[PDB]
Design a protein around this ligand. Structure first.
Ligand code: LDR
Length: 115
């Protein structure tokens, strides 16, 4: 249901995406920049456990390709990326700590959505 505010909300989404990729958050965002290379990392069970991989470069391509029709669709992909991390790893793994920090950035700015 294309709403008049969808373009404006999508711009806010794109701003969040840019911030997540910025040097400000690089110390904890970097694992999420590119698709997990499970074979390279020796995680030979990754794709048996994670059926729907997601990462910030894929979100960016989807935004650039106008794949996301609304803010909700974008938000579901960013949250899928984090949930994949919380599903695969023990909760005390360093990468989970980084995911929680990056998700806090995401959620608090996503909540400042103009509407
Ligand atoms: O969920 C992840 N688990 C891992 C476990 C061990 C090494 C690396 C990663 C990793 C790297 C980049 C993004 C996500 C992950």
């Amino acid at each position: 249901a294309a709403h008049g505010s969808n373009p404006e909300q999508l711009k806010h989404c794109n701003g969040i995406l840019k911030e997540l990729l910025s040097k400000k958050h690089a110390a904890y965002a970097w694992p999420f920049y590119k698709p997990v290379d499970a074979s390279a990392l020796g995680l030979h069970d990754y794709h048996d456990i994670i059926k729907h991989p997601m990462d910030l470069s894929t979100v960016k391509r989807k935004m650039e390709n106008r794949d996301y029709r609304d803010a909700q669709e974008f938000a579901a992909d960013v949250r899928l990326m984090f949930s994949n991390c919380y599903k695969y790893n023990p909760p005390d793994h360093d990468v989970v700590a980084m995911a929680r920090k990056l998700q806090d950035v995401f959620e608090f700015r996503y909540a400042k959505m103009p509407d």
